[PDB]
Design a protein around this ligand. Structure first.
Ligand code: HEM
Ligand code: HEM
Ligand code: HEM
Ligand code: HEM
Ligand code: HEM
Ligand code: HEM
Ligand code: HEM
Ligand code: HEM
Ligand code: HEM
Ligand code: HEM
Ligand code: HEM
Lengths: 140, 142, 146, 145, 140, 142, 146, 142, 146, 145, 140
């Protein structure tokens, strides 16, 4: 899953879609807005980071940490040993958060929702394979 | 009256308010909506051309025929010999149709009011329009 | 042939630029030349207009008939942006010409030639192609039935 | 030309305002059924020629109605590209040559039923442009029929 | 799958993404370009409609017929009995074309690729459910 | 009448003239200003909602409730079973209120005139609007 | 929380894009799902709607009640650009709900959840944050007094 | 009433609808066209200033004199001592002119309606305008 | 001198910016200073205003006369974009001043000086050249005949 | 957020249209007096707490009225810069902590009296935006009171 | 000094120059920047309100209070009894701040410096008279 050719395609489209500076913040807020719109039960899981107001600094900061982690993982997609160690670190952090498989399936569909709306070209096949590569490393 | 200068002013302002294409329907709708509101019995005179629904295609064709006839006369205001012949023919199309004599002053009032609303009320020469419109309808009515 | 959206926009603008009531001593000149041309191409057509003094062209009676007929085209030309109303008007004009003995559909082909001869001489910027197709769309609606 | 670029543009715009995927399927079925009702009476074509047999409450017929207007929808939206539209009409022509009972007159009746129903739900429709463009569509579909 | 709420969302986003007039042609060409880029083996299946030149009238006409069928199906998504009959008709036409499940999975990923690039909002969850609803009706 | 095609046209044009936000007050003001001018006794029926000052906040809320009820019925024009149930409930809110039977034809005339003024008179289908509006008020009045 | 100018602009546009009378077979679907969700979260609330045949959801009687109730929200949502009129309307709605035995303010918290569950599924482009705050501004005006 | 806050609102909206230059003729034309339609006998009161042709230069000067007098009073709404002296002088110019007592409520209705049409009907405070306009005309009439 | 199109545009804007009914406690101040200046330059002119309590300037009677007179200038200044109506108004004003014993044309030359002294003190952005020519065009129309 | 940028912008624009230095001082006094009249009846605060004793004909009270609305004017016009506005409200908060009798409820009453009087002289006012922004101003001034 | 005609002129030009919203803040900062540029010894008098950073919220707030007071005084220029009472209140507040006549002369020149740079018309005669009217009421 997620071969060396697909990694380059996903790295290129992510960097362009994720953008820079405040665009990353609006992108990250849009991602969790789509997550909540897809799975309403996932919103309560973030009650500890100011999810009551999604424009607050506290919740915007959480969204950037998650997309920033997605950013650092995609950045290391072509270094298999490095990303495996990083995903294992993330898997350890998420193990106590009472998450299930549908939580990560909803996050994936949220990614498949927001990423292409900031692009002119999007290969959902490569993104499906490479997101699955990342999510399975975290989910367990 | 309707002096030679009045006829130039009426011709210019008529062409402006009458206009081209569908703008002629905008002027016509102002005339028939005003006429029928001030004289509700006039609508019955147009039962053959669907006067109950002035927005129908049938009545719009009639409306543009009438405005075309008025445009015809307005354009010939400065050509009195031809105007008289145009008015004589228009009289033949209206005589014994049962048209009340009060309908022509009322139509004049509606036509002038619609032109005034389209070109603007400021400096509008009601005397030129009334006198020149009266020369036209007096050749048609009766 | 089809009178397209671009055709009727061109024809309506150039016609109204010549026929507008804002000008003087144009309608009679244009309308007289049209009928002068019609009689020059169809000497038999003049007999159909004996009630309007066709043998005295400069009479107010014949001048008024020319203006009256050609203004009917102005009414129809300015309906080209509302063909639903145009179809009602062309049906109205057809019934009036069916009640006139001797008026045949081939006469409108001669009337088209008369306009096709007069308009290029009078209208700055004239598109004969657009004129021929949009006149046909109006004339074919009238001449149906006869 | 017949169905000029200007004619095609206004026809497409008015058609998509009246017919698009954001509308309810019942509404699009109601328009297509009305089109077929008009076509049946002007062409005299037997409704038994179609699946569902012209019955507006038969799901088989409403699907057949959906397929026919969709074919017209595809042709209409391609009116500004004559080369692409010619190919679409040529494919439709080959399909209807293999169908016993389809005549060029009936194809014209159905194309005119489209224009007349559009002008009923959109009375401001450019019915001359509709006549020219649907005649162009009808000539391609019923070529040789 | 593809409930009444999802149908409205998908109908709205499809009509806006599919567009009008020549935009439908460019959209339809983009869809099959993404299909070929995702599954190269699917291109040969269209050798009978001028796939050698994807800008030709013959191949553009085929792309519009497919997206037009997708257009008529989505239009009838909220009329279950009508769309079932139409999908059954389409299933009969595709049964002799030697297609498999991956062909339809690739077409779906192509749809998930091109549709959101013409939108500002895209719900891939609803599109996944409702595309699956349509494709399963055709695939058999 | 009010055919299936009429209902699509009325729904489209109603939504356009009705609009969003404060545009709904623009349509409502056209209706009540026309209704009260043609039928001055109708204003007394709205004394509890400050009919003497149609620009007050109290009457505007009432106006938008009424237009909301009409919008409710217009939207359900192609869903006859639900429409009948909506109309039956609206009848219960108006019965024994002392509303003259002439008020409903007058309100229809004002509503249609206001929609016509907002969307444009050219090609306006008075037959579709009258027939579909009559189906609505006939379920409310009496 | 405050329903800001940007909030109500967003909410009014996305709501009207879904609820407009120009579309068909949307209002019933949306309104039914709202009440289906309400009953799923508060089984006791169904008893308050015994006069509208709540046990037969696909009846024209219950469908009309759902549309009638939700359209009341449409009226209030489209008043967000004239809060002086909105306050008059919310006071009117409050008196009507006080005269209904058993309707409590906590029920509107369940109604908010039902809309918060239905709207994301139906409205392309949906801002739950803006919706939650502007629904609260309307619902708090109605549920005052009970 | 006409509270101190009402006078600030009326002054602001009057200046807006009254405006500058020829915009004042636009407001005046709305007033006289409405007044003469609702009270046709009022036009005869203005025979000396060519009331039959409200678009003439003679009547426009009269119209702007009247609106100037109203503007004069509106501007002094928050200066009651000066207002009373202004109204007393205006009373002397109208007494024994044969002006029917019904003309002043009718003029108030036309002036308010014209201001409302110019500044917009939404949120228009009819109570402030009626109460402040009534203070003005009650000092002039009689 | 001629009050040009640019002159009256400038004068009408700066005057209305000071005299608008939207402001308070400006008209009396301006109008009082004008008449204070007039009496300072022509002590005999005060006798012509004995019916308006000229010897008690702060009386409501004299304040109302000042506002009444100066507002007459506002009416005339705002007619500068319709000189056909202005000429009718200036003829009307002339007949009223001819019926007042003692009012001479030289008094308007003193009234011009009073405005020429007051306006620069009160109007941010003031063009004395444009004011002098357009006041003359109005004042000459009134003072004709006396 | 409460009193968003859009809310602040419309509040500032409507406030400065109703209250600015180009207006007559009598007009600004008339608005401020009306604000205080409303505040006195909704808060029950004694007018003897203020210089001039609430008497609208006392120059001492009209100056006190001018100072209070000016403080609100400065805060309102600073609404689009929260950092600057927070500092302005913090200074006002410290001043009123040293004043015996000022409660947080009364500060809310006075801030609401501002919004209600504005809506009387400007009936088209955005009273929701006024409520949110004046509540934000009131919370800063009466913090801890 | 500062007659009724001059008051109207100054009120009009002040309101237009002072502006609205953030323009008032930039205007107020410019005023004290010109004051410090004209009399460097006056800067230390404001060490208690964050004058070390003139873009800080604390110093911007002080500048708005001073120009806001100037705003409320000019607003009441035509109500002699009201502005006299207000100036007396301000004179009481400034009496303990160890200010001299040159401090107020420098502030006046600062006002004469910043106000006309936001205007197309400026009457320095009327402003000189009316500022002197205001400053003398505060200075003692
Ligand atoms: C799929 C890629 C994901 C990545 C890269 C990721 C990464 C992160 C990161 C970097 C943090 C910050 C931890 C900290 O600094 O304290 C975090 C926190 C968290 N994430 Fe994830 N995450 C992912 C998926 C998910 C999903 C799908 C869910 C739930 C549906 C989730 C729920 C949470 C929660 C509940 C927290 C902690 C919130 C708190 O601190 O109160 N994560 N995640
Ligand atoms: C300047 C004034 C008028 C002009 C130029 C004019 C001209 C015309 C014209 C050209 C027609 C078309 C006749 C046809 O093609 O059959 C017509 C028809 C008609 N007009 Fe007039 N008209 C005028 C005034 C009036 C007035 C004041 C009335 C009634 C109050 C009236 C009533 C009618 C009627 C009843 C028809 C017959 C419509 C039909 O049944 O086809 N006209 N008019
Ligand atoms: C576009 C082409 C034409 C138009 C728009 C048109 C229109 C008209 C109009 C408006 C009238 C006046 C009817 C009346 O006043 O009663 C008329 C009369 C008449 N037209 Fe036509 N016409 C056209 C072509 C022709 C042609 C080609 C002929 C025969 C060669 C013809 C024969 C007549 C006759 C005989 C009359 C009767 C004149 C009379 O006796 O008063 N028309 N036409
Ligand atoms: C503008 C006119 C027309 C258009 C655009 C059109 C288009 C279509 C389309 C797209 C289909 C579906 C093909 C498929 O299943 O893949 C179809 C089927 C069919 N058409 Fe036409 N058509 C038109 C006129 C007509 C007419 C006039 C007739 C008969 C007189 C006709 C008879 C049929 C029949 C019977 C079928 C069903 C064939 C089957 O079930 O296998 N069509 N048409
Ligand atoms: C998923 C939704 C699909 C829809 C709505 C659809 C619809 C259509 C339509 C309307 C046609 C036109 C048939 C005709 O008019 O002759 C067609 C042809 C065809 N489609 Fe599909 N199709 C779908 C999926 C697919 C997929 C996934 C493939 C292959 C990977 C495929 C392969 C073909 C082929 C080979 C043809 C015939 C080409 C030819 O005529 O030479 N289709 N399809
Ligand atoms: C399609 C036509 C109409 C519809 C949809 C409609 C709908 C409504 C609605 C929804 C209300 C709100 C009731 C409430 O909340 O208490 C209402 C109130 C009312 N309507 Fe109608 N209405 C229509 C026609 C009329 C007409 C023609 C009249 C009188 C001539 C009328 C008179 C009233 C009155 C008196 C009230 C009570 C207002 C009050 O005191 O609160 N309605 N209407
Ligand atoms: C934003 C939220 C709500 C709005 C806008 C709203 C509005 C409405 C409207 C317009 C009606 C129709 C009144 C009539 O036709 O007589 C109604 C009826 C009613 N509502 Fe509400 N409502 C809301 C929430 C609720 C909730 C949460 C409850 C209870 C859990 C409730 C209980 C009722 C009841 C019992 C009726 C009576 C239905 C009948 O018997 O006909 N409402 N509401
Ligand atoms: C606020 C309300 C009104 C104001 C401020 C006002 C003011 C004026 C003014 C300033 C003049 C100019 C007098 C002159 O220069 O000779 C005038 C003239 C006149 N006004 Fe009024 N007026 C008002 C209402 C009315 C009404 C309601 C009527 C009649 C229904 C009326 C009838 C007249 C007449 C007949 C003249 C004499 C015109 C002439 O012959 O020169 N006025 N008014
Ligand atoms: C542009 C310059 C002037 C204008 C626009 C003007 C206009 C007016 C107006 C509107 C009135 C009120 C008439 C009434 O209410 O009955 C008036 C009255 C009067 N004016 Fe003039 N005036 C001007 C210059 C002068 C001058 C220079 C004089 C004499 C030096 C003068 C002498 C008078 C007198 C004596 C009255 C009578 C006041 C009374 O007894 O009530 N005016 N003027
Ligand atoms: C939005 C609400 C308020 C604002 C903006 C405000 C602002 C101000 C300002 C700017 C001053 C002048 C400070 C100075 O002299 O330098 C002041 C003084 C004063 N305020 Fe407030 N205030 C508010 C509410 C209140 C309330 C609710 C009370 C009493 C219940 C109050 C009591 C006072 C008193 C008594 C003074 C005079 C203190 C003295 O003369 O030394 N204020 N206020
Ligand atoms: C000329 C018009 C002036 C006005 C309208 C004015 C007004 C004000 C105001 C309203 C305050 C706020 C007091 C508070 O709320 O605590 C203040 C403070 C102050 N002003 Fe003035 N002032 C003026 C002139 C000056 C000048 C010329 C200077 C020095 C050169 C000066 C030095 C100060 C100081 C030192 C403070 C206190 C700073 C602090 O709080 O640490 N003022 N002034």
């Amino acid at each position: 899953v997620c071969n060396r050719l697909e990694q380059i395609l996903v790295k290129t489209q992510w960097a362009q879609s994720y953008g820079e500076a405040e665009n990353r913040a609006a992108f990250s807020r849009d991602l969790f807005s789509e997550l909540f719109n897809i799975q309403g039960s996932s919103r309560a899981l973030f009650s500890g980071v100011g999810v009551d107001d999604m424009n607050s600094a506290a919740f915007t900061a959480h969204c950037l940490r998650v997309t920033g982690a997605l950013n650092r993982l995609i950045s290391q997609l072509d270094q298999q040993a490095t990303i495996n160690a990083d995903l294992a670190h993330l898997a350890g952090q998420h193990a106590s958060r009472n998450l299930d498989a549908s939580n990560f399936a909803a996050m994936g569909q949220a990614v498949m929702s927001v990423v292409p709306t900031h692009l002119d070209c999007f290969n959902q096949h490569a993104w499906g394979e490479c997101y699955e590569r990342i999510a399975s490393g975290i989910s367990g | 009256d309707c002096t030679s200068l009045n006829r130039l002013l009426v011709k210019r302002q008529w062409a402006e308010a009458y206009g081209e294409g569908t703008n002629r329907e905008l002027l016509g709708n102002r005339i028939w909506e005003d006429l029928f509101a001030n004289m509700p019995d006039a609508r019955g005179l147009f039962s053959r051309v669907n006067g109950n629904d002035i927005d129908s295609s049938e009545f719009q064709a009639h409306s543009l025929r009438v405005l075309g006839g008025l445009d015809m006369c307005v354009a010939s205001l400065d050509d009195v010999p031809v105007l008289n012949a145009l008015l004589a023919r228009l009289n033949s199309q209206h005589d014994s149709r049962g048209i009340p004599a009060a309908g022509y002053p009322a139509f004049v009032a509606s036509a002038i009011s619609a032109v005034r609303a389209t070109v603007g009320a400021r400096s509008f020469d009601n005397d030129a329009w009334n006198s020149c419109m009266n020369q036209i309808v007096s050749g048609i009515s009766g | 042939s089809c009178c397209s959206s671009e055709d009727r926009a061109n024809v309506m603008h150039n016609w109204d630029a010549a026929w507008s009531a804002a000008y003087s001593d144009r309608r009679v000149a244009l309308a007289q030349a049209v009928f002068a041309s019609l009689f020059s191409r169809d000497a038999a057509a003049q007999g159909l207009f004996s009630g309007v003094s066709a043998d005295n062209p400069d009479s107010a009676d014949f001048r008024a008939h020319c203006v009256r007929v050609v203004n009917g085209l102005d009414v129809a030309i300015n309906m080209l942006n509302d063909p639903a109303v145009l179809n009602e008007q062309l049906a109205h004009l057809s019934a009036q010409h069916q009640a006139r003995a001797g008026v045949a559909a081939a006469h409108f082909d001669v009337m088209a030639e008369a306009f096709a001869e007069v308009m290029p001489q009078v209208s700055s910027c004239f598109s004969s192609d657009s004129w021929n197709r949009c006149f046909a769309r109006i004339a074919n609606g009238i001449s149906a039935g006869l | 030309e017949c169905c000029s670029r200007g004619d095609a543009e206004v026809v497409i715009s008015e058609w998509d305002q009246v017919f698009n995927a954001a509308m309810a399927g019942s509404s699009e079925s109601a328009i297509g059924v009305a089109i077929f009702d008009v076509f049946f009476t002007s062409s005299g074509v037997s409704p038994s020629m179609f699946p569902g047999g012209g019955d507006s409450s038969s799901a088989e017929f409403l699907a057949q109605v959906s397929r026919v207007i969709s074919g017209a929808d595809i042709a209409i939206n391609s009116l500004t590209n004559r080369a692409t539209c010619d190919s679409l009409l040529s494919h439709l022509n080959a399909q209807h040559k293999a169908i016993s009972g389809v005549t060029g007159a009936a194809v014209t009746h159905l194309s005119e039923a489209i224009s007349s129903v559009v002008a009923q739900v959109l009375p401001s429709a450019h019915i001359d442009a509709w006549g020219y463009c649907m005649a162009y569509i009808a000539a391609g579909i019923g070529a040789g029929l």
